[PDB]
Amino acid sequence: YELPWVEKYRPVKLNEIVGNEDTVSRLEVFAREGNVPNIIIAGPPGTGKTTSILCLARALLGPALKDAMLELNASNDRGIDVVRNKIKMFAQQKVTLPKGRHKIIILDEADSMTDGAQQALRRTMEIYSKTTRFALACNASDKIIEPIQSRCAVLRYTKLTDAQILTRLMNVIEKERVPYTDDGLEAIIFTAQGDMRQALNNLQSTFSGFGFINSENVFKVCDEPHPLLVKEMIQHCVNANIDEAYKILAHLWHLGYSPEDIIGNIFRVCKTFQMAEYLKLEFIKEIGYTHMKIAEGVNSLLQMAGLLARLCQKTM
Amino acid sequence: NPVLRRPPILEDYVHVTSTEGVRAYLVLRASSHCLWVDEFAPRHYTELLSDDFTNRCLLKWLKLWDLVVFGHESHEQVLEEMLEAGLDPSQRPKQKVALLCGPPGLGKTTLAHVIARHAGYSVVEMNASDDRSPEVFRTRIEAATQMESVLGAGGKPNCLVIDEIDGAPVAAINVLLSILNRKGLLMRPIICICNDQFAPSLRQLKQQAFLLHFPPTLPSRLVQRLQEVSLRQGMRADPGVLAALCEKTDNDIRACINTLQFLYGLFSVWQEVFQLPRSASQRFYRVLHAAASAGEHEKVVQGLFDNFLRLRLRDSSLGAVCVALDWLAFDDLLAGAAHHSQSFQLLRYPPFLPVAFHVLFASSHTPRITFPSSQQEAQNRMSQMRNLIQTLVSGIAPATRSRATPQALLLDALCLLLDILAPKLRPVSTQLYSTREKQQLASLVGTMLAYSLTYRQERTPDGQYIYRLEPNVEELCRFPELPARKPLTYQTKQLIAREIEVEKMRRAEASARVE
Amino acid sequence: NLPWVEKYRPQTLNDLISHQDILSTIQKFINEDRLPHLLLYGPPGTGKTSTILACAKQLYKDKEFGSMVLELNASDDRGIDIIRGPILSFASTRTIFKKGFKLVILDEADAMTQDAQNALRRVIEKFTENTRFCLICNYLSKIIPALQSRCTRFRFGPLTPELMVPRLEHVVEEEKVDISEDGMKALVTLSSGDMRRALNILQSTNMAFGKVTEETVYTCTGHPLKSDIANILDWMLNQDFTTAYRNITELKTLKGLALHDILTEIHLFVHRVDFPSSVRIHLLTKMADIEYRLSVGTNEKIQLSSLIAAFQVTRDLIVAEA
Amino acid sequence: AKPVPWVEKYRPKCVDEVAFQEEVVAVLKKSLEGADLPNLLFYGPPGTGKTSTILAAARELFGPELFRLRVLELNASDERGIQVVREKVKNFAQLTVSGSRSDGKPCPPFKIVILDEADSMTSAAQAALRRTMEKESKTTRFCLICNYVSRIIEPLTSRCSKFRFKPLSDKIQQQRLLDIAKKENVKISDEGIAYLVKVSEGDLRKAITFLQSATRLTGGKEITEKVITDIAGVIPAEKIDGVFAACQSGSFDKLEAVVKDLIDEGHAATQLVNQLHDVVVENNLSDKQKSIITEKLAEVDKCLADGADEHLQLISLCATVMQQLSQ
Amino acid sequence: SLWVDKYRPCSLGRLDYHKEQAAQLRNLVQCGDFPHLLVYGPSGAGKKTRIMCILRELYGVGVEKLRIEHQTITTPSKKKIEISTIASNYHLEVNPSDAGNSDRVVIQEMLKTVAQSQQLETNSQRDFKVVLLTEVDKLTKDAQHALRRTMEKYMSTCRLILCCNSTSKVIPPIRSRCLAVRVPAPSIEDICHVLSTVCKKEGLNLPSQLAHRLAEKSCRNLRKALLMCEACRVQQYPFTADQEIPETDWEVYLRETANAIVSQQTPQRLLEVRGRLYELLTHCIPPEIIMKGLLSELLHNCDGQLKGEVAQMAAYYEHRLQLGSKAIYHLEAFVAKFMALYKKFMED
Ligand SMILES: Nc1ncnc2c1ncn2[C@@H]1O[C@H](COP(=O)(O)OP(=O)(O)OP(O)(O)=S)[C@@H](O)[C@H]1O
Ligand SMILES: Nc1ncnc2c1ncn2[C@@H]1O[C@H](COP(=O)(O)OP(=O)(O)OP(O)(O)=S)[C@@H](O)[C@H]1O
Ligand SMILES: Nc1ncnc2c1ncn2[C@@H]1O[C@H](COP(=O)(O)OP(=O)(O)OP(O)(O)=S)[C@@H](O)[C@H]1O
Ligand SMILES: Nc1ncnc2c1ncn2[C@@H]1O[C@H](COP(=O)(O)OP(=O)(O)O)[C@@H](O)[C@H]1O
Ligand SMILES: [Mg+2]
Ligand SMILES: [Mg+2]
Ligand SMILES: [Mg+2]
C-alpha cells in the first residue's frame, strides 16, 4: 500500500518549491511576517500552486490549521448555497489566532466555479479581510472575473524551466537509487512539457513498468509519437519532399496513432525546430489550420497528406 | 524521371492520356493585521480618489434627496441639467435610483459609502446574486428601504447600496422595477453598482435610473497617492515603477495597492515585441516564453491590433501588414473553432500571435506604444449603438415595424427619412404659413406620429436653448467626415414641436371620443 | 442465439491475443499489488473492456464481484452530478467482504467535460489506497493533462491481420459458414482493424448472402473494390471530362458507392502511382480540400467532378512533362 | 377526408409491393428460418419505401397482435434530443414481455425499434445512439433508415447490416405520374413529365411534391415549363446562355451586369453552381478550362455551404470563367 | 405619412410587377391545403408585400390589425429572455434570429406555445392559421432542425411562411417540404412605372430621365427608390433631369473610403482607412454589406487587368469574415491586400 510519488515527494516547506523564485521568496517573506494579502496563483498544471498555497497555510497557522483553514475543492459541490453558507460562516467564525497569522480559505480550481459563486465570493473577501485571506489556485485567469483578480494579488507561475525539473528529478532518483540513462531522462522532460507532476508520474510509472529509465521504456509506457520521427517529418517537409515524409506518415498511421496526437506532436516538435523564423511562422499557421480541420471532425489520413502538401508548397 | 511513355517491363502500370493523346504510363510499384487597501481607506471626503465631477454630482444628488426623508428645505452639462430637471409633486427626484458603472477597482463602493456617511445616512450593503431568488430580493428590497429607524428619537435613516446587480437574475431587476414604478411608496435612495453597463438585464433599468459612468482615474494623482502610501509605509519612493505599474493595470487602485503590498507584464511584452533589445532564435525563444508567461492574451492581442500600424513602417510592399493581418485573422478563426469544438489542444497557438509580430515589426526605432485600446472603445460604441437601434425599433408602432427589418431600416430607410424630415421652411408663424406648407406640416406630423419621435428642448452650455431629437437618431445615420448639411432653424423646430404635441392631444381626444 | 461479437468476448487472459505486453504488465501489476489507476486508450473495438473485465474476474470470485467493481459509462447521464454521486461514494468506502482495493470501470471516458475531469482527478487523489480507477477512452486528447498525470496510459493500437485471422477462424470452426480464401483478406481489410465490425459484417453477409466471398462482403458493405478504383482512376487519367464524368456517375449510381470511400481508396492509390512530386503535391492538396469540402454538406456530384477536374489538370501536366 | 399528400399515400404497403427489391425480402425470408438477425440500416433516396418495407417486415415477424406491443417506431429528426434517445429506448427495453405468441408459432425473443431519417442527427446525438445500441444489444434490436452513408458516423455504421435501396430508376415513373394525372384529372404533356423526372436526381418524392405544387398553382391549367422551372428550383436555360455569352468575351461591366442580374432574379447561387456545372461538364470546352471552372464551382459551393455572401462569390466565379473563356 | 408604405398594395390584382406569380399564388391559395411557403429573393424586391398580400387573400378583412406582444422564455441556463412578436387575430409573425445562441430555445418553446393554443371559433374562419418567420436564414443548424420538426408535427394545424434572402445557408431538408416562392427584384421599367404611379397620384410631373436615374441608383430596391423620390420632393419640387439625388451617408462614406484607399498606398493611409472602417462598423451595419459596397465603389476605378484578382480576394476575405468572429481583421486584411496589389500594379 505504498503511496505514489506525486504525494510522497510533495514539499513540506516553502523553500523546496522550484517554480517561480521571486514569487516563492516573497511568499516566504509573507510566511515569516504574517500579513499575507489576498493572493491568486495562476499558471499551467504541475508548477506547484497547490503545494505553495498548502505550505504557506501550514507555515502561517501551524497547530491551528484544522480549524483556521478551509480547503474547498472541485470535487465538492460549489453551488450558490455553498458560497452562501460554507464560505460565509467560515469567514464569520472566530479562531484564537496570533497577531499576524490569518484564517485561510484555500479555493483550488477557482476557474471551474460558476458566476454566482464568484458573485458571492467578492463581498466576502472584501469585507472579512481583517480575519480571513483568500489563496486562490487556478489554471486560466480568463474563466475568473476581472474583479477577483483586481482585489487579489495575481501571481503568475511560469511553466517550469527544464533545469529545475532536472534538479528535482535527481533528488527523487537519488532518493530511490533508480538507474537511468541520460537521454531517457531528457525523454521524460519531453513527455513532461512544463508539467512536473506528469514528469514524476511518468518516471514512477516507467520504473515500475520496466527497470532502467531509458528512452525506450518511457516511450513505451507513454506511446506518444516519437520526437525523432516527427522531427524527420518536419525536416522532410522543409526541403520540399512529400514522399519521404509520407513514409513517416504511413509509419505513424499504421502504428495506430490517432490524428489528434499526431498533429499535437507535430506542433510541439515544430515549436523548437531549427529553421527560418518566417518559415516557422507559416508552418505554425498551417499546422494550426490542419488542427482545426482535425478538431472540427475530419480525422482522415488525407488531412495529414494535405498538411504535408501545404508545408511542402510553402517551402517554394 | 518518374514518367515513361514505354510500357513497363514486368510491373503494373496506369495509362495517362491528354487532349492530344500521347498515352504515357505510370509505374504502380493593527498595522500587520489589516490590508493596505483597508488601512488606507479614506474616512473623509477630502482624501477621495475619483473624478471630482462624479463625486460632486453624487453629493448633489444625495443632497437633493434630503427633502422627503429629513423634511429640510458636453455630457457634463447634460448631467448637471438633468440633476436640476424639476421635482416630482411627491417630493421625489425624477432620477430615483443611481446606476454607477465602470471597470473594477476604482472606488465606486468607497465613494458610495463615504457619500452616504456624508449625507446623514446609515450605510447598508447588498450583493444581488448572493441571494438570487425573487422572494428574498423582494423581502430585502422592502426591508432595507421603506422603513424608519429603531434607535432613540429617530437617529439617522438608511440608503440601500446594491452591489453586483450586473449579474443579477432578471426577476430581481423586475422586482426592483416594480417597486420603483409604484404610484407603499419608495422613499429611500437606492444606489446600484453594475460592472457591465451593456448587460441585457440592466437595459430597462437605465431608461429610468440616474447614470454616473465612471471615467478612468488620471495617473498623476494616482502616482502622488501611491507615493504617499509608500512614504507612510516606509517604502522607497520610486515613481517610475509606480507610473508603469499603474499603466499596466488600467488605473485600478486595488491592483496597484495589492501589488505594492505584496512587493515587500503587458508593457514589457509589448516593448520586447515592438523593439529589439539594446541570435534571432534567442530572442524568438525569449519572446515565446514571455508570451507564454503573459497569460492574458485577449488584452495583449487587442493592444497589438491598436499599435502595429502606428509604428514608423518603411515597408514598400505592405507585405508585413498583410502577413500580420492574416496571423490575427488566423487567431480569430482558431479561437472561434476552439470555442465551437471545445478542444483544449488548440489553446497553445495564440501565444504565437505576438511572437509573429516580433518577427514582422521588430522596429529598432523607439516605438510610441500607446496603452489605451481603441478596439474596446469601438466595441463599446457599437454596443451603445445597438441599444439605441433596439430602443428606436421599440419606439415604432407594430404597423411599420412589421413592414421592414431593423437591418433594412438602419441601412436603407433612416437617413433618407431624416432628409425628408429636414425641409426648407421659412421662419414665420404658423398662421402666416401658406396652404402648401400646412399640408406639408400635416405630412410631417403624420410621419412623426407614425414613427413616435418628437423634438425636445435642452440647454446649450452657452446659456441659450436648442432643440434636439427625442431618441437622437443622427448618430447612427450621419458620419463625422462628411460634407455637413444645414440643419433646421430654431423657430421651425419649435413650431413643429408644438404641432407634435397638438397632434398628440388631438389623437388622444379622438380616441377618447370614439371609445 | 446472439451475434458473434457478444458470444466470444474473450473471458480468459489466454483467449485474447496481440496485446501481450499490456497482458504482461497488468498481470505483473496485479500479482505483486502495484496496480495504479489505469487509462486505456486506443481505436474502437480492439478489446479495452474485455481485458479489464477479465482481470477483475481474475482477481475476484463471482460471489464477491458485486461489491468490488462498479461499472459506469456514458449511457447514463454524465457530468458534475454523477461524479459527486456513485463514483466517490464507491471510492471513499471500504469493502463489504474481506479486504483489498476496489475498481471503478468507466467506459468511453473522453465524453465528459473538463470540470467533471477536474472533479474526478481530485477524487483520484483523495482515495487511492482503497480505489483503483479504470478509465477507457477513445481519444487521449480529450482528457486534461493532469488526469493523464494521474493514471498510467495504455495504448492498444491496431489489430494486425496476422493476429486477427485465427479468432475469425475459430468462430468459423464453431459456426459453419461458407467462406472462401478471399473472405479472411476482405474481413481483415474491410473491418479496419476493428474486430467488432468483423464479427458484425460476418453475420451481416452470412444472414444476407449466405456464402462469404470478396464480392458478397463488398456488395453488402458497399465498399468499392480495387478493380473499381483502378477503373475510376483509369477513366480520370484517360478519358475527357464528359466521358469520365458520365462513366463515374453511372458507376456511382449503379453500385451505390459513396464519394468519401472513393476519396479514401483513391488516396491510398495515389501513393502507389509514381507521380511527379509537384503533381502529387497538387493532388494531395486538392484531395484534402475535397475531403474537407464533403464534411460540411456540399453536393456530392460537384465535388466528384472537382476530383475529376484535379485529375484532368494532372493528366495535362504529366503529358506536358513527358 | 383530409387532403393526403401522394407520397405516403402512394407508398407500398406489403412485402412484395416494393417494386423489385426481392433481395430485401429474401434476406429476411432467410432470417425467418434462422430466427436471428443483427442491427439493420437501410440507406437510399426517399420515396423508395424503407419504412413501409420494415413495417410490413416486422408485421411478418411478430403479427398484428404483437406489432403494437413489440415494434417501436420513432423518427430521429423528430427525436433529435439526447434525452429522448437515452430515456424512451431504455424504457422500451426495460418493459419486457415474453417471445411467445397465442397462435403457437415460434418467435425470437428480442424487441424491434425503428429510427427513421437518422442521417440528420448530429455527431453527439449519434454517439449517444451508439451508446444506446451498445448497452441494449441483448433485448432490443436496432434498425435505421437514412438517405446518405457518411452522414451516419463510422461507429454507428460499424455495427449494422447495410442495405442499399434502389428506386424506380428509369421508364416507370413517367407512366406512373401519368396514372396520377389521369386519376386526378390533370392535363400535363410528355415534356413536362420528362422535365419532372429530370429535375429530381433519382428522387420520386421530389417529383410527386413538385407535381402537387404545380397542380396547386395552376388549379386545372396546363403544366408548362415555366411553372415547373419555378417550383423545382431551376434557373432557366436562357439565363445560363446569357451568363456564358457575357463571360465568353467582353468586359467586367457586362459580368457585373449579369451577376447583378442573377442575384436580383432571386436565384440561389448553389443552383447556379449546379446548373453551370451541368453545362460545363457536357459542353465542348477544353479540359483545362473545364477543370478550372469546375474546381472553382466546388470552392464556391463550399463557401456557400459555410454561409458566405453569394454576390461576391458569383462575381469571382464569373470572373474566373471569364478569364478561362476569353483566353 | 410616407408614401413608401401609404400606397402599398393590398389585393393581388393591384400589384405593379410580377403579375404571373401573383396569379399563381392567388390560384394556389384559392383552393385548400395551403402548403408551407419559403419566400426568397433579393432585399427590397417586395417579399413582405407578397406575404401580407397572401395573408389578405387567405383571410377576410382583419389582416392589418397588428400589435406587439412580449413573451419570455427560459434557457437551459437559468436566464429569462424576452422576445418580441408582431401578431394579429388571424396570424403570427416572429423574428426568431434576434436570440443568437438560444435560437433553438425560442424555436422549440414559442411555436410549441402557439401550437398548443387553440383557435377560438375555428369553424368560422378557416382550417388553420399561418406563422411568419421573418428573419430565418441566419438561424443555426439545430434550430432549423427543430424548425422542420415543428413543421412536421403541426402540419395539420400550423403552416409556416419563412422569408429570407440568400438561401445557401438555409438547410436542405426544410427546402424539400416547403413550396419555394421566388420574388425577383423589379426591373428598371417596373420601378419607373411604380414611381410614375406614385407621382401621378400625388399630383407630380416627374420626368422619365430622372426616374431612370432613381432606378439606376436604387440598385433594384423599391423602398430605397421611393425614399429617394420622397427626399427629392422635399429637396426641390420643380424636378429637373440634372438633379442632385440625396444619396445615403454610408454609401458616400464608402465612396470617400474607396478614394482614401486609392489615393495612397502607405501604412498611415491604412491607419486612416482602418479608422473609417471602424466608424462604419460601429453603426451595426453588416460587414458583407460593407464588403459589397467597397467592391462596387472600387471597380469604378481599377484597371481591367486587375478587377479579377480584386474580386477573387473580395470573395476570399468575405468568406473568411463569415468563418471568423471579428470583422475588422478580415476587412483591413482585404484593404491591405488591395493596397499591396495596386502598388505592385503601378510600381511595375
Ligand atoms: N515546484 C515544484 N517543486 C517540486 N515538486 C513539485 C513542484 N511542483 C509540483 N511538484 C510536485 O508535483 C506534485 C503535484 O503538484 P501540484 O501543486 O498538486 O500541481 P498543481 O500546481 O496544483 O497543478 P494542478 O492542480 O494539477 S492544475 C506535488 O505533490 C509535488 O510532488
Ligand atoms: N483614496 C484611496 N486611496 C487608497 N485606497 C483607496 C482609496 N479609495 C478607496 N481605496 C481602496 O481601494 C478599493 C476601492 O475599490 P472598490 O470600491 O472596493 O472596488 P470597485 O471600485 O467597486 O470595483 P469592483 O468592480 O467592485 S472590484 C478598496 O479596497 C478601498 O479600501
Ligand atoms: N485481442 C482480442 N482478442 C480477441 N477478441 C477480441 C480482442 N479485442 C477485441 N475482441 C473482440 O471484440 C469484442 C468487443 O470488445 P470490446 O472490449 O467491447 O471493445 P472495446 O475495446 O471496449 O471498444 P469500445 O467498447 O467500442 S470503446 C469482444 O467481445 C471480443 O470478442
Ligand atoms: N406594386 C407595388 N406598389 C407600390 N409599392 C411597392 C410595390 N411592390 C413593392 N413595393 C415597395 O417595395 C418595398 C419592398 O420592401 P419589402 O416588401 O420589405 O421587400 P424585402 O422584404 O425584400 O425588403 C416595399 O416597401 C413596398 O412599398
Ligand atoms: Mg491545483
Ligand atoms: Mg461593484
Ligand atoms: Mg466496450
Numbering used by the authors:
A (entry chain B): 34 to 349
B (entry chain A): 165 to 193, 276 to 319, 346 to 455, 480 to 560, 585 to 598, 627 to 863
C (entry chain C): 19 to 340
D (entry chain D): 35 to 361
E (entry chain E): 2 to 349
Paste lines from the article:
Proliferating cell nuclear antigen (PCNA) is the eukaryotic sliding clamp that functions as a hub protein and plays critical roles in many essential processes, including DNA replication, cell cycle control, nucleotide excision repair, break-induced replication, mismatch repair, and chromatin assembly. In this cryo-EM study, we reconstituted the human CTF18-RFC–DNA–PCNA complex in vitro and captured seven intermediate states in the PCNA loading cycle by CTF18-RFC, including an apo state of CTF18-RFC before it encounters a clamp, two states of CTF18-RFC bound to PCNA, and four states of CTF18-RFC and PCNA interacting with the 3′-ss/dsDNA junction.
States 2 and 3 represent binary encounters between the loader and the clamp, with the 3S-binding mode (state 2) and the 4S-binding mode (state 3), that differ by having 3 versus 4 clamp loader subunits that bind PCNA. In the binary CTF18-RFC–PCNA complexes, the A-gate between the A′-domain and the AAA+ module of the CTF18 subunit is closed, and the binary complex becomes more compact transitioning from the 3S-binding mode (state 2) to the 4S-binding mode (state 3). Interestingly, the transition from 3 to 4 clamp loader subunits binding the clamp (3S- to 4S-binding mode, states 2 to 3) involve only rigid-body movements of the CTF18-RFC and PCNA approaching each other. Interestingly, we found in the 4S-binding mode (state 3) structure that the C-termini of PCNA-2 and PCNA-3 interact with RFC2 and RFC4, respectively. Specifically, two positively charged residues in RFC2 (Arg-91 and Lys-99) and one positively charged residue in RFC4 (Arg-93) interact with the C-terminal carboxylate of Ser-261 in PCNA-2 and PCNA-3, respectively. The interface between the loader and the clamp increases progressively from ~1,600 Å2 [the 3S-binding mode (state 2)] to ~2,400 Å2 [the 4S-binding mode (state 3)] and to ~3,900 Å2 [the 5S-binding mode (state 4)], Therefore, we suggest that the increasing surface area of interaction between Ctf4-RFC-to-PCNA drives PCNA ring opening.
